[PDB]
Amino acid sequence: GSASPAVAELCQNTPETFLEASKLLLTYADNILRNPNDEKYRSIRIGNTAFSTRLLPVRGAVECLFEMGFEEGETHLIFPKKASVEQLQKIRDLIAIER
Numbered sequence: 043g044s045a046s047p048a049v050a051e052l053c054q055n056t057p058e059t060f061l062e063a064s065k066l067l068l069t070y071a072d073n074i075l076r077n078p079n080d081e082k083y084r085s086i087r088i089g090n091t092a093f094s095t096r097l098l099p100v101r102g103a104v105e106c107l108f109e110m111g112f113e114e115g116e117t118h119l120i121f122p123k124k125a126s127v128e129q130l131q132k133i134r135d136l137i138a139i140e141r
Contacts (some may be wrong), residue, residue: 043140048109051102063103064137071134084121109133
């Protein structure tokens with residue numbers, strides 16, 4: 043939680059919103075951790091229903107993805123092939139312990 047600036051920001055949300063955003067964040071991280079060699083899990087379309095309605099408008103949500111290693115592009119958030127999976131897991135854990 044507080045050990046992460048983005049998670050600390052995410053914590054500044056009501057319970058239901060925090061749980062909803064954090065669940066999706068954990069799903070994105072877990073998909074990559076489950077299959078780190080599948081490019082499908084390394085791209086999140088900004089216009090995606092879940093992303094646009096549960097993360098984009100929530101304080102700290104997208105920032106957590108950036109701390110995980112995602113980078114923002116014109117239409118997608120991308121987790122580079124060079125991005126550290128250890129860092130991804132670190133932020134994943136910091137989010138999980140706050141649910």
